[PDB]
Amino acid sequence: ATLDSWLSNEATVARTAILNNIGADGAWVSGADSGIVVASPSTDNPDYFYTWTRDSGLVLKTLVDLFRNGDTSLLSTIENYISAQAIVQGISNPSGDLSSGAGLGEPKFNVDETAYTGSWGRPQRDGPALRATAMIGFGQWLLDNGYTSTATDIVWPLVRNDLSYVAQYWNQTGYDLWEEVNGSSFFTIAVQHRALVEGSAFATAVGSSCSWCDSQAPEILCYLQSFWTGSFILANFDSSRSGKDANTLLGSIHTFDPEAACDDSTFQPCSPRALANHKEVVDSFRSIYTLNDGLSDSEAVAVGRYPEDTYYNGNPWFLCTLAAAEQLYDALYQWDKQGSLEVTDVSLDFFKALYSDAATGTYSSSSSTYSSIVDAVKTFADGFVSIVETHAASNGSMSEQYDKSDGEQLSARDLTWSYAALLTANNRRNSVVPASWGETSASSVPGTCAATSAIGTYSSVTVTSWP
Ligand SMILES: *[C@@H]1O[C@H](CO)[C@@H](O[C@@H]2O[C@H](CO)[C@@H](O)[C@H](O)[C@H]2NC(C)=O)[C@H](O)[C@H]1NC(C)=O
Ligand SMILES: *[C@@H]1O[C@H](CO)[C@@H](O)[C@H](O)[C@H]1NC(C)=O
Ligand SMILES: *[C@H]1O[C@H](CO)[C@@H](O)[C@H](O)[C@@H]1O
Ligand SMILES: *[C@H]1O[C@H](CO)[C@@H](O)[C@H](O)[C@@H]1O
């Protein structure tokens, strides 16, 4: 009731906003190539006129989701991005060459498909996974509508390069999703795990093999366990920060599997760890912003990246505020699809701050307890999006961040990611979900975590024809 009017109307502007940010024929990005997702049109203060593989990948996943839920008009925009990545994967850069393997870690490029040869927090090893993920799902659609040549000769060998990457380089160090902390990032490892699992499944589906996907996936999932502290999920290893970061919120929602239970080992949205993490991570912003003064632990607050952040002084982020909501909406989906809502001693505070009478127990859909909690949850999540609404522009625009005291838009305008974050949260509020990646099978923690690698092949896809 309280935001549907705005959500559905905003979601319309979000779709078109993304398309204006993708060349060659996007309104706000003249000079960009066909299928290059510019992160933001802003060309100074700040100059975001580039194309980040991460940003490109998270957006295209969202576009693939929509496309498969019946928005078939996205076909050319999605395709165009496939042909773009063909050229992009082969751009030799400060991080490396394509035949090397390294340099699929290259955080960003120019909009004309040329390397960025300036200093940058490189490499970031999330990108290759995040691309393969976005591509894989459109591969599945191609298969399940009989376009096998495009699925086998164009889509697979792009996804083969990125899979080859993740298996080889995962256990080596690199910079986080915020481009700041050199180490091992949770988000990075989470989204990398998903890629080899769903990439193995998809590579089997084109009459082929991803032998390296298989060996390493449990090893990454083995490593992943270590990020849990008991209290919450650590953002990065090798950091003097608290470890509370939106990083982890995003790791959950972008590895959310619908055919899956509240599994602590893959850190799903309804899992005790991610639930505890949401309590901890969101709390960490309560007092540090003047914008959130007089907003109790039952109500929602403007959410940032992390409390140690000093970038633009360190404000609330729209996509991060939208991530707080999205985990909760995936939680509400998974409790519905289960017919259960386990309160554990781990999660306890998460519920207790929203539902005063919350306590340790399993409570099915039928119970009084479930009904009261999911109202409180729905309201809490609805709370964040209401804050997103408030500081969103009159014509529906969203920036990267919004001021810490008074909430005005700050940093890069028309951030492509912000719109994708909106399109995703809104979807999950209306029970719209993405195809499973195979979590059911990939939940067993191994015996011992082996700091190892495995190798693939690396081969350059030419944009040959269109079958
Ligand atoms: C490479 O992988 C190994 C496990 O395969 C990781 O080892 C863990 O590292 C964390 C953080 O230092 C420790 O708390 C664990 O106790 C380690 N476990 C073991 C068995 O060594 C290692 O951190 C990984 N490193 C990178 C950069 O990926
Ligand atoms: C809203 O108007 C501003 C004016 O500069 C524009 O830059 C922004 O892209 C607009 N948003 C739309 C049309 O969604
Ligand atoms: C490696 O594989 C790629 C993509 O299938 C080809 O373009 C290349 O010629 C080599 O066979
Ligand atoms: C694969 O890599 C080669 C060498 O960079 C390119 O020429 C080709 O277009 C594709 O990107």
Task: Give the CA angle between residues 178, 124, 16 to the nearest 5°.
Answer: 65
Resolution of the determined structure in angstroms stands at: 2.3
- How was this entry determined? X-ray
- Decide: 89 in ligand 4 pocket, CB within 6 A: yes
Question: Can you say which residues are annotated as belonging to the binding site for substrate?
Answer: 120
Which residue type does 131 have?
A: R
3-class secondary structure per residue, the chain = CCCHHHHHHHHHHHHHHHHHCECCCCCCCCCCCCCCECCCCCECCCECCCEEHHHHHHHHHHHHHHHHCCCHHHHHHHHHHHHHHHHHHCCCECCECCCCECECCCCEECCCCCECCCCCCCCCCHHHHHHHHHHHHHHHHHHCCCCHHHHHHHHHHHHHHHHHHHHHHCCCCEECCCCCCEEEEHHHHHHHHHHHHHHHHHHHHCCCCCHHHHHHHHHHHHHHHCCECCCCECCEECCCCCCCCHHHHHHHHCCCCCCCCCCCCCCCCCCHHHHHHHHHHHHCCCCCCHHHCCCCCCCCCCCECCCCCCHHHCCEEHHHHHHHHHHHHHHHHHHHHHCCCEECCCCCHHHHCCCCCCCCEECCCCCHHHHHHHHHHHHHHHHHHHHHHHHCCCCCCCCCEECCCCCCEECCCCCHHHHHHHHHHHHHHCCCCCCCCCCCCCCCCCCCCCCCCCCCCCCCCCCCCCC
Q: How far apart, in whole angstroms, are the C-alpha atoms of residue 95 and residue 122? A: 7
Q: How far apart, in whole angstroms, are the C-alpha atoms of residue 100 and residue 183? A: 22
For atom 11 of ligand 2, the residue with the nearest CA is 397
**For ligand 1, what atom is nearest to the CA of residue 189?**
28
Ligand 2 centroid–CA 403 distance in Å is 19
Q: Which ligand is nearest to the CA of 103?
A: 4
> What tokens does 208 get?
């082929």
Among 36, 88, 89, 98, which is best to mutate for testing ligand 4, by the most ligand atoms less than 8 A from CB?
A: 98
Task: For 334, list phi and psi in degrees, rounded to 5.
Answer: -75, -30
Q: How far apart, in whole angstroms, are the C-alpha atoms of residue 418 and residue 311? A: 17
Q: Which ligand is nearest to the CA of 398?
A: 2
**For ligand 3, what atom is nearest to the CA of residue 457?**
1
CATH of 4-441, one of 3.60.150.10, 1.10.8.60, 1.50.10.10, 1.10.1740.10: 1.50.10.10
Residue with tokens 């030799």: 92
Catalytic residues: 176, 179
**For ligand 1, what atom is nearest to the CA of residue 450?**
5
Short-list 318, 336, 306, 171, CA closest to 246: 306
Which residue type does 438 have?
A: G
Short-list 346, 219, 361, 340, CA closest to 279: 346
371 Cβ contact partners less than 8 Å away, ≥ 6 residues apart: none
Scored b (16 or more CB within 10 A) or e, 332-354 reads bbbbebeebbbbbebbbbbbbbb
